[model samples]
Target: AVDEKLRDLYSKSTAAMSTYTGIFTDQVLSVLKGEE
Candidate 1:
C-alpha cells in the first residue's frame, strides 16, 4: 500500500520536492520526506 504510493510518487517525478508536512502518515510521506 505505502510502497505503491511511494513508487507512484517517484514515477511521477515528485521525489525531488519531498518535504515534511507531518508524521509517517499517508497524509504526509514522512518516511522519505525527512524530519519536520
Candidate 2:
C-alpha cells in the first residue's frame, strides 16, 4: 500500500500546485493588464 499512499500524496500535491498556479497566473495577468 506504500505505492497507493505515494499516489495519494502526489495527487494532493498536484492539486495544491494547480491552485497556486491559477492564483499566480491571475495575479500576473492582472499586473500585465495594469490593474491595481
Candidate 3:
C-alpha cells in the first residue's frame, strides 16, 4: 500500500501546489506530509 499512499500524497500535493506555485513547495510539503 506504499504506492497507494504515495499516489494520494501526490494527488493532494498537486492540488495544493497548483494554487501555491512554489519551486519546491510540493517537494517540501510532500516530504513533510508523507509517511517518510
For each candidate, the alpha-carbon lDDT, in order, equals 0.48, 0.58, 0.61
TM-score of each: 0.17, 0.26, 0.26
lDDT of 3: 0.61
Candidate 1 segments exceeding 4 Å error: 1-6, 14-36
Candidate 1 displacement at residue 34 in angstroms: 43
**In model 2, which range of ten residues has the least summed lDDT?**
21-30
- In model 2, the clashing pairs are none
Name the regions of candidate 3 deviating beyond 4 angstroms: 1-6, 16-18, 23-36
Q: Against the correct fold, how does model 1 do in TM-score?
A: 0.17
Candidate 1 residue-wise lDDT, 1-36, digit = tens: 366564564566444444433334465443555754
1: Cα error in model 3, Å? 19
Q: For residue 33, what is the lDDT in candidate 3?
A: 52
Angstrom error at residue 7, model 2: 3.4
> Number of clashes in every candidate structure?
0, 0, 0
- Candidate 2: misplaced stretches above 4 Å? 1-6, 15-23
- After TM-score superposition, what is the CA distance of residue 5 in candidate 2 from its true location, in Å? 5.7
